[PDB]
Protein backbone atom coordinates (compact mmCIF):
# COMPACT_ATOMS: atom_id res chain seq x y z
CA UNK A 1 0.00 0.00 0.00
CA UNK A 2 0.48 3.79 -0.63
CA UNK A 3 2.82 5.09 -3.43
CA UNK A 4 4.45 8.14 -1.65
CA UNK A 5 6.90 6.10 0.36
CA UNK A 6 7.59 4.00 -2.79
CA UNK A 7 8.08 7.31 -4.74
CA UNK A 8 10.56 8.55 -2.05
CA UNK A 9 12.77 5.35 -2.27
CA UNK A 10 13.01 5.47 -6.15
CA UNK A 11 14.33 9.08 -6.11
CA UNK A 12 16.75 8.18 -3.24
CA UNK A 13 19.32 5.89 -5.05
CA UNK A 14 20.48 8.59 -7.56
CA UNK A 15 20.57 10.98 -4.52
CA UNK A 16 22.68 8.47 -2.53
CA UNK A 17 25.08 8.43 -5.42
CA UNK A 18 25.12 12.31 -5.79
CA UNK A 19 25.38 13.62 -2.20
CA UNK A 20 26.67 10.72 -0.02
CA UNK A 21 29.52 9.17 -2.21
CA UNK A 22 31.96 12.17 -1.70
CA UNK A 23 30.84 12.35 1.97
CA UNK A 24 30.81 8.78 3.40
CA UNK A 25 33.69 8.68 5.89
CA UNK A 26 33.97 12.59 5.63
CA UNK A 27 32.04 12.98 8.89
CA UNK A 28 34.72 10.70 10.49
CA UNK A 29 37.81 12.33 8.65
CA UNK A 30 36.92 15.94 9.62
CA UNK A 31 35.27 15.54 13.05
CA UNK A 32 35.77 11.99 14.67
CA UNK A 33 38.79 9.77 15.25
CA UNK A 34 40.45 10.01 11.85
CA UNK A 35 40.79 13.72 12.59
CA UNK A 36 43.68 12.83 14.85
CA UNK A 37 45.21 16.37 15.52
CA UNK A 38 44.22 17.35 11.83
CA UNK A 39 40.84 19.10 11.20
CA UNK A 40 38.41 19.35 14.13
CA UNK A 41 38.20 23.16 13.40
CA UNK A 42 35.32 25.49 12.29
CA UNK A 43 36.91 26.53 8.83
CA UNK A 44 36.42 22.81 7.75
CA UNK A 45 33.27 22.00 9.78
CA UNK A 46 30.74 23.46 7.18
CA UNK A 47 31.61 21.09 4.29
CA UNK A 48 28.73 18.39 4.80
CA UNK A 49 25.28 20.09 4.41
CA UNK A 50 24.07 18.46 1.08
CA UNK A 51 23.59 14.80 2.38
CA UNK A 52 20.72 14.00 4.75
CA UNK A 53 18.26 12.29 2.46
CA UNK A 54 21.03 10.40 0.58
CA UNK A 55 22.14 8.62 3.72
CA UNK A 56 21.99 4.67 3.84
CA UNK A 57 20.15 5.20 7.24
CA UNK A 58 17.06 6.31 5.28
CA UNK A 59 17.39 3.55 2.67
CA UNK A 60 14.50 1.37 4.08
CA UNK A 61 13.47 -0.20 0.71
CA UNK A 62 10.22 -1.94 1.56
CA UNK A 63 8.66 -4.33 -1.04
CA UNK A 64 10.78 -3.69 -4.22
CA UNK A 65 7.97 -4.55 -6.67
CA UNK A 66 4.79 -2.82 -5.37
CA UNK A 67 5.50 -1.16 -2.03
CA UNK A 68 4.11 -2.40 1.39
CA UNK A 69 3.58 -0.74 4.89
CA UNK A 70 6.40 -2.52 6.91
CA UNK A 71 7.03 -6.29 7.06
CA UNK A 72 9.52 -6.35 4.15
CA UNK A 73 11.75 -9.44 3.63
CA UNK A 74 15.27 -8.74 2.25
CA UNK A 75 16.18 -12.19 0.74
CA UNK A 76 13.27 -12.24 -1.77
CA UNK A 77 12.95 -8.54 -2.52
CA UNK A 78 9.36 -9.35 -1.37
CA UNK A 79 6.85 -9.50 1.61
CA UNK A 80 4.69 -11.98 3.71
CA UNK A 81 1.53 -11.67 1.56
CA UNK A 82 3.48 -11.48 -1.82
CA UNK A 83 5.81 -14.46 -1.13
CA UNK A 84 2.83 -16.76 -0.34
CA UNK A 85 1.12 -15.45 -3.50
CA UNK A 86 4.18 -16.21 -5.70
CA UNK A 87 4.57 -19.73 -4.04
CA UNK A 88 0.96 -20.67 -4.76
CA UNK A 89 1.79 -20.22 -8.43
CA UNK A 90 5.22 -21.91 -8.11
CA UNK A 91 7.19 -18.81 -9.34
CA UNK A 92 9.80 -19.15 -6.40
CA UNK A 93 12.59 -21.80 -6.84
CA UNK A 94 14.04 -24.31 -4.32
CA UNK A 95 10.98 -23.94 -2.18
CA UNK A 96 10.14 -26.60 0.35
CA UNK A 97 7.47 -26.74 2.92
CA UNK A 98 9.33 -27.56 6.22
CA UNK A 99 9.36 -31.19 7.27
CA UNK A 100 12.18 -32.89 9.01
Amino acid sequence: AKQSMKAREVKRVALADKYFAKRAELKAIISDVNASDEDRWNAVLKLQTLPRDSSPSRQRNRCRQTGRPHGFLRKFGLSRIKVREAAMRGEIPGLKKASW
Binding site: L73, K75, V83, R84, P93, G94, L95, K96, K97
Partner: protein, 103 residues
Protein backbone atom coordinates in the same frame (compact mmCIF):
# COMPACT_ATOMS: atom_id res chain seq x y z
CA UNK B 1 45.75 -35.11 7.62
CA UNK B 2 45.43 -35.76 3.89
CA UNK B 3 44.50 -32.51 2.11
CA UNK B 4 42.91 -31.92 -1.24
CA UNK B 5 44.69 -31.11 -4.55
CA UNK B 6 42.04 -28.70 -5.99
CA UNK B 7 39.04 -26.79 -4.57
CA UNK B 8 35.55 -27.17 -6.11
CA UNK B 9 31.91 -26.35 -4.80
CA UNK B 10 28.60 -27.37 -6.35
CA UNK B 11 25.63 -25.20 -5.36
CA UNK B 12 21.92 -26.00 -5.64
CA UNK B 13 18.43 -25.17 -4.19
CA UNK B 14 16.83 -28.71 -3.56
CA UNK B 15 17.69 -32.37 -2.95
CA UNK B 16 16.66 -33.77 -6.42
CA UNK B 17 18.53 -30.84 -8.14
CA UNK B 18 21.91 -31.47 -6.41
CA UNK B 19 21.87 -35.33 -6.97
CA UNK B 20 21.20 -35.07 -10.74
CA UNK B 21 23.46 -32.08 -11.36
CA UNK B 22 26.33 -33.66 -9.34
CA UNK B 23 25.85 -37.09 -11.05
CA UNK B 24 26.27 -35.23 -14.42
CA UNK B 25 29.38 -33.24 -13.27
CA UNK B 26 31.02 -36.47 -12.00
CA UNK B 27 30.18 -38.00 -15.45
CA UNK B 28 31.82 -35.02 -17.33
CA UNK B 29 34.89 -35.24 -15.05
CA UNK B 30 35.51 -38.98 -16.15
CA UNK B 31 34.63 -38.24 -19.81
CA UNK B 32 37.34 -35.45 -20.12
CA UNK B 33 39.96 -36.71 -17.54
CA UNK B 34 41.39 -39.97 -16.14
CA UNK B 35 41.72 -39.22 -12.41
CA UNK B 36 38.50 -38.52 -10.53
CA UNK B 37 37.30 -37.97 -6.93
CA UNK B 38 33.78 -38.99 -5.91
CA UNK B 39 31.75 -36.28 -4.10
CA UNK B 40 31.65 -35.64 -0.37
CA UNK B 41 27.97 -34.60 0.76
CA UNK B 42 29.03 -31.54 3.06
CA UNK B 43 26.64 -29.94 5.74
CA UNK B 44 23.64 -28.66 3.76
CA UNK B 45 22.29 -25.23 4.60
CA UNK B 46 18.66 -24.40 5.51
CA UNK B 47 17.10 -20.96 5.60
CA UNK B 48 14.13 -20.22 7.92
CA UNK B 49 11.26 -17.89 6.88
CA UNK B 50 8.06 -17.22 8.73
CA UNK B 51 5.29 -15.37 7.10
CA UNK B 52 1.49 -15.10 7.79
CA UNK B 53 -0.83 -17.45 6.19
CA UNK B 54 -3.55 -14.75 5.78
CA UNK B 55 -3.53 -11.08 4.54
CA UNK B 56 -4.68 -9.78 8.10
CA UNK B 57 -5.42 -11.27 11.64
CA UNK B 58 -4.87 -14.69 13.27
CA UNK B 59 -1.93 -15.99 15.23
CA UNK B 60 -2.89 -19.65 15.81
CA UNK B 61 -1.18 -21.47 12.90
CA UNK B 62 0.77 -18.91 10.61
CA UNK B 63 3.36 -20.15 7.95
CA UNK B 64 6.93 -21.38 7.90
CA UNK B 65 8.84 -21.77 4.44
CA UNK B 66 12.19 -23.64 3.93
CA UNK B 67 14.89 -23.33 1.22
CA UNK B 68 17.82 -25.70 1.39
CA UNK B 69 21.11 -24.98 -0.24
CA UNK B 70 23.00 -28.04 -1.18
CA UNK B 71 26.89 -28.36 -1.33
CA UNK B 72 28.91 -31.03 -3.12
CA UNK B 73 32.74 -31.33 -3.09
CA UNK B 74 33.42 -33.39 -6.29
CA UNK B 75 37.12 -32.32 -6.76
CA UNK B 76 39.63 -34.38 -8.91
CA UNK B 77 42.80 -36.10 -7.76
CA UNK B 78 44.58 -34.66 -10.77
CA UNK B 79 44.67 -30.80 -10.40
CA UNK B 80 44.05 -30.28 -14.21
CA UNK B 81 42.26 -26.98 -14.90
CA UNK B 82 41.10 -28.13 -18.41
CA UNK B 83 38.86 -30.68 -16.77
CA UNK B 84 37.29 -27.87 -14.50
CA UNK B 85 36.62 -25.50 -17.53
CA UNK B 86 34.70 -28.39 -19.17
CA UNK B 87 32.98 -29.37 -15.86
CA UNK B 88 31.41 -25.87 -15.26
CA UNK B 89 30.55 -25.37 -19.01
CA UNK B 90 28.64 -28.56 -19.75
CA UNK B 91 26.55 -28.24 -16.53
CA UNK B 92 23.30 -26.86 -17.76
CA UNK B 93 20.88 -29.17 -16.05
CA UNK B 94 18.54 -28.81 -13.05
CA UNK B 95 19.68 -25.25 -12.39
CA UNK B 96 22.73 -25.77 -10.32
CA UNK B 97 25.79 -23.48 -10.33
CA UNK B 98 29.28 -25.05 -9.70
CA UNK B 99 31.84 -22.53 -8.40
CA UNK B 100 35.42 -23.06 -9.64
CA UNK B 101 38.85 -22.11 -8.11
CA UNK B 102 42.58 -23.17 -8.26
CA UNK B 103 44.21 -24.22 -4.96
Amino acid sequence: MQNQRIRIRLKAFDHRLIDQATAEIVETAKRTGAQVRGPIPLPTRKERFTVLISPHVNKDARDQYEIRTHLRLVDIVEPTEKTVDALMRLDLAAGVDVQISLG
